[PDB]
Design a protein around this nucleic acid. Structure first.
Lengths: 96, 82, 109, 91, 97, 79, 102, 92, 88, 69, 96, 81, 106, 93
DNA sequence: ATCGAGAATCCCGGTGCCGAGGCCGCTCAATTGGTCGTAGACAGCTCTAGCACCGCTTAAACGCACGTACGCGCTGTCCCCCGCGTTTTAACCGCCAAGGGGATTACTCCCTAGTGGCTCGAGCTCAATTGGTCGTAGACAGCTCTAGCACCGCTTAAACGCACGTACGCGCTGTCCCCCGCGTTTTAACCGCCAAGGGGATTACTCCCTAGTCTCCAGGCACGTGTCAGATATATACATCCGAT
DNA sequence: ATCGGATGTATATATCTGACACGTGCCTGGAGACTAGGGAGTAATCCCCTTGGCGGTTAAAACGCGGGGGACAGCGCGTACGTGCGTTTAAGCGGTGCTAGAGCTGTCTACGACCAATTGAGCTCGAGCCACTAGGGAGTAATCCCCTTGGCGGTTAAAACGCGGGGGACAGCGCGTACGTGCGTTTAAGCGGTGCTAGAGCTGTCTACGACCAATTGAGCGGCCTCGGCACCGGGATTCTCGAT
């Protein structure tokens, strides 16, 4: 037998809501942070604590935004999140 | 291997983040959209952070610059240098 | 005219938290010109109180998970499941803490 | 290079002696106490400044605790604080 | 028996009231609200009028901002009538609930 | 007492009109009242405590603006 | 007056007093209050220009709160700076959601 | 009974920018609350980042990094220019 | 004096004298418990409840009277109202 | 003390309830009604005090005793 | 041999008060329930126990309404039950 | 696929219901009136029920949805489920 | 040793163990004391016995050996206390007490 | 395949009080609905009455004050009697 | 309130059937025992506030009398419901099978049991405490005049209730996009060890900057004043919206 | 798109009044000036933690693909909401007390800063102790069969119906009773307090008592079969209405 569409999705929801680890691969995020930082000032070093603080912040922010986006989607009587939902959510949030 | 790293944020990673937020079905044009929002969120915090380390006349961004930046922009973070 | 044995104000108040440190922080923090003498024992007393509240909730939360240490996840479960404490810390994110399990009901089978 | 670690451990072993704390959770705890400190001292300084007084006493600290803390927290905290002060004044 | 199409004087009123710059609630019922609501927290308070008007300016500003957010939620669900689902979603996203 | 209902339905309608909404369902008129009440209950609660620390018995405009500022809603025009 | 040596209208002396007396630090540097005065005058002048042209374009001669509200809320940066702020008696920018037009 | 404000200075600059136009009392209260607010922002942040670097003096460098923190974009740039200009003219 | 309906229907203030009602509630309470004390908030809550209940019963009673083609309230009407409202 | 509730007061109520004329036998009758209502609510109220190891009836006890109706 | 008006009637009152069966026919009530239910959802089926619950509720409610209405009718010095009475009864009951 | 079934609640049925309720003489314009009342009553009990059924994510409403619907409407029913 | 049911230690027919399980699972409290389910079971048995005697005598009075819904309805509706307790309930297949208003008689 | 009820216990009590009489299926459903209903009333009031008093445990005291609240008059006496007598007959294990 | 008639129910003895009731095999929900951590019982204390009691105005309860509305019982007209026989309808039974769909089962995935970091002591150091001086915030009480309640008479905007109809909310239906589950293939993350130095941090050293104090005076606050900018009142001019062509 | 033809807003034109701008008078604070001494700047140096560097494995990303379920658009209906009118209501403007208390004042004590010296608490540093292969639960896809839906075929109970005439609805009428009212009398609620102390509400402490755990088993449950209690019938026996008088 084979899984109906949208079952492994809820398995992943239970699994990752019960989980407590970082969900973005460490080194791509690290160079993302470094590349972004090079715009504001060049020739920068980072203590590892700093990039990991930035990753904890980033991921926390993104999961909260994703819950709000899911609420917008459900409010439109849907189950699929779409940029309509993200833009509506961070517009009520006042995030310009 | 330092340019275009916003693409390095894989679709599975974003997918996981979204699953933690409780979403069941995810449209495809979100994978770019979310990248964008992240790019800007991060763009703000580092900017604040960098000015802090630029004011202390150092060259390493310290964890305190990040946590101060996050507070400054209304998102207090517990667990890194108090 | 020898001194008396130095005893700490934190002990006189009946507190674990450091009244002396709290006092120093008050004066040095450029909050006032003058810090009253009973202020730091009050502030220390409240900081110890809230510490005790979240620390018990987190402690027995971890004991339900059959573990001998308190890890970030346990204290976040402590905070986010208490209406008042969750309200107080609504704008903070406990690093390495995760999120409360909750699936929107319309999405369940 | 100081922190609040020993005091939160003392309170911990006071309430749940068997359980311990990891370093990360310890940083969460003292980061928390630091934040809430800056909140209480902030409001105390602001309303001392509003009423044109140059002294932050136990009276301002308690109105700050009443403004920031929610419901029973603000009540239970206020009890501890006043009781501590009395235990301090008589001693 | 001239009749305006349903919807005309509505946005006519929104044009009016958006260009206006005055308080939109009767100040004396609002004052009675402020007095009764305050009466629980402390007995026989006096209010300088500037203060009650501060509270009305704040209240009305808050409510019009909330109303634009709720209206945005309503249109996002592809209707035009705002209903309490919209208000609750809006406040839940701004962090009020 | 029982003053909440004194905030007439036309008034609520006006606030809504300034917010740009065209058509409004009826069960908002009660909902909004609730929304207002608790909101007011918070700011006023702050204000009076500001008064009580200052050992006065009249709430001043400065207590209101301080209450609003400490709730992330700064208000210009009263001091 | 120091304000004249600096070349500004705002009071360097007052702001200096406020910094010292204000529970910000113990020692206040000598160049701080003239910098701060300069920045406060700058922002003041900007919103006063935008408000000036708002009132003048309204054919009224005197700046009223509403003119300051239109001034602030129609300028991107100023709108961000004064985002969680509430201009009493200012009203709202005329804006009708396009989906609601007839 | 003497309660100071910023009214005279916002009026002086107002006549600098629009000599013909005037200002209402209410708008004057908004202006004065505004300058008070922005003062509290810049001085607050300046004090905090002075406290972060162990320094005990709020100088023009703390004011300018604070103004870079709080003011957005071109506002921040122009402000930092004005501040340096005033300081330099004052020094001579 | 149909004005009495005008006046008292527009009003929002207690219509039974407070402390006589206080002794009523106290005497009634003596059956269920000895040496009860009452904080004033409670006696005012139950007096407000009393007034609400009595005015609603009185509207129903007037509906019965009007339905019987009379204008004066009689025990017939109050008992009819309470025997269809689900009361004893 | 049931006759403490006075005829002008019962009147004020019936008028508040929109009554034009009032047969004289109403008063005792409505008095009786009042009693039973009180007799019920009060009772529940005190069993909320007895359960709370208390001897004074607080107003919460009367609002809980009231919502039981 | 006609029966005087009003004696077969209370004969029927005795008979139906002593009886206990449902008094409205089964299949008409069933189709009524189906037609009414189609408004809220169209593809609905009903367990037979469910429609029987709904009929027991309906008939019980109607006999209670009819006895209260009988009380109002008698209160207006009458013997004939008429819509005046039912509307008064559901007015005081709060049934609107 | 049905309509106009409120007339299916026959006049003798309503008459019987009244007889059990103790009614002796029944006016003629009641038989329609009663139907009206019945409809709205049923319309509510069914609607409530469906939300319970929809909440259990089924396509048949069970007797427990009826009993829950009635219990919320203050009319608890014994004998089903 | 060999296990006994709590209902038997209590001297009850109704299941103390079931009542406890239902109390816990229904999330009425965080924690349920040990005397609660035995008490509650005792009261359910009491009321059950009350209605079952009255209904029993109803069926007996009506030349029948079996309790039918009508017997339960006659039992409750003729007992003031039960009829109050069960005032807003409807006994399916139970009918109504025989009652003709005197004004409607000849 | 198994679904629970109170049928065997109301049969036990029935044969305790009326050994000769029996019961039909519908009457059995009425009895079971009665037991479930009164259970939910008593447990509901007990839970709310624990909450009002900020106490986290439902004791026999909560059940008995709830029973005093829901049951009318003399029933509430016998109920309070049986319930307490049984508890003591249980306490002596 | 009679008597015959006679209609309707009531009653009793027989028919037979379907569910009530009991045995049974069995499974799964209740029982069992020991730890232990904590909810709550219990006691005592702090001081709120509940209670019983003071007089004093005056608002209101009270006691009559008066004359009038109303309701209650009687009568006449008449509308329409009841009872009944005859026709018409579709309900009911039972039975039937097809199958939807809810119950039940068989997998499957999760989630535990089992075989390096965080606590503990030895050695400093930097900060907390002590206690005595000294200068000032602020405690405290009161005098004043602001300004906040309170009420009030008029007008008239505005709330309000409601009648009417269309436009929008909401569901239902069909189709086709496009997301998910899953297996295979392809990256590039992660990890493993390790050192060279950048740069953060310490220290030590003198010295520029600022606080702090006092006297001088002018810049800024509080009122007073006069007026013209805007407020208010009315009319017209113009931009619309509505419907029909 | 495009005329008429209303409707409502913008603007204008007149008039005027009070909010604003400027002087006038005062007085608090900012400006010089000066030295001390403390934080800041600079040098040298110490040492840690950031950065690289490279392959190797393989965990994860990327990809491809079949289908299935959900987005989404179109359409249909019913009823909630928007417009509009007439009536009612209280808001708000204006202008009046009166007195609670916000606001300013002086004064003298407390109290908190400031310092030196003294010690100990808290920090640091190093050392050393605490993955796989089963078996229950939780979801879940397949499969089982129960219970919903719909057809037969009628006959036959039950709805329909039509009609007269009996009685109850109801409208009016007359009259007598028993509310309503008004005004003179009183009485007790209400109100500002005091005097006292029960208890409430809070804190602290200690125990008893419920959560919690797999392992065991016997109480209860689905199945199944049997039989008598109960529904139903026919025909007589009773009672109960009806008419005439």
């Amino acid at each position: 037998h084979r899984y109906r569409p949208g079952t492994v999705a809820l398995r992943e929801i239970r699994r990752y809501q019960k989980s407590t680890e970082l969900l973005i691969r460490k080194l791509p995020f690290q160079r993302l942070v470094r590349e972004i930082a090079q715009d504001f000032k060049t020739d920068l070093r980072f203590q590892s604590s700093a990039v990991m603080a930035l990753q904890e912040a980033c991921e926390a922010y993104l999961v909260g935004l994703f819950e709000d986006t899911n609420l917008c989607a459900i409010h439109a009587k849907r189950v699929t999140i779409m940029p309509k939902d993200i833009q509506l959510a961070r517009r009520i949030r006042g995030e310009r | 291997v330092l340019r275009d790293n916003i693409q390095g944020i894989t679709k599975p990673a974003i997918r996981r983040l979204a699953r933690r937020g409780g979403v069941k079905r995810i449209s495809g044009l979100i994978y770019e959209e979310t990248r964008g929002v992240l790019k800007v969120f991060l763009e703000n915090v580092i900017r604040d952070a960098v000015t802090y380390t630029e004011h202390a006349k150092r060259k390493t961004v310290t964890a305190m610059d990040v946590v101060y930046a996050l507070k400054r922009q209304g998102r207090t973070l517990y667990g890194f240098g108090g | 005219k020898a001194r008396a044995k130095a005893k700490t104000r934190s002990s006189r108040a009946g507190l674990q938290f450091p009244v002396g440190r709290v006092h120093r922080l008050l004066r040095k923090g450029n909050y006032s010109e003058r810090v009253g003498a009973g202020a730091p024992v009050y502030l220390a007393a409240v900081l110890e109180y809230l510490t005790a509240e979240i620390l018990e909730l987190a402690g027995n939360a971890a004991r339900d998970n059959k573990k001998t240490r308190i890890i970030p996840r346990h204290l976040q479960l402590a905070i986010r499941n208490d209406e008042e404490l969750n309200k107080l810390l609504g704008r903070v994110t406990i690093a390495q803490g995760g999120v409360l399990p909750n699936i929107q009901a319309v999405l369940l089978p | 290079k100081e922190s609040y670690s020993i005091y939160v451990y003392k309170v911990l072993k006071q309430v749940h002696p068997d359980t311990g704390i990891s370093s990360k959770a310890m940083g969460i705890m003292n980061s928390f106490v630091n934040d809430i400190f800056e909140r209480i001292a902030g409001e105390a300084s602001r309303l001392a400044h509003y009423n044109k007084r140059s002294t932050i006493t136990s009276r301002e600290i308690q109105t700050a605790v009443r403004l920031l803390l929610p419901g029973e927290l603000a009540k239970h905290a206020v009890s501890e604080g006043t009781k501590a002060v009395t235990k301090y004044t008589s001693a």
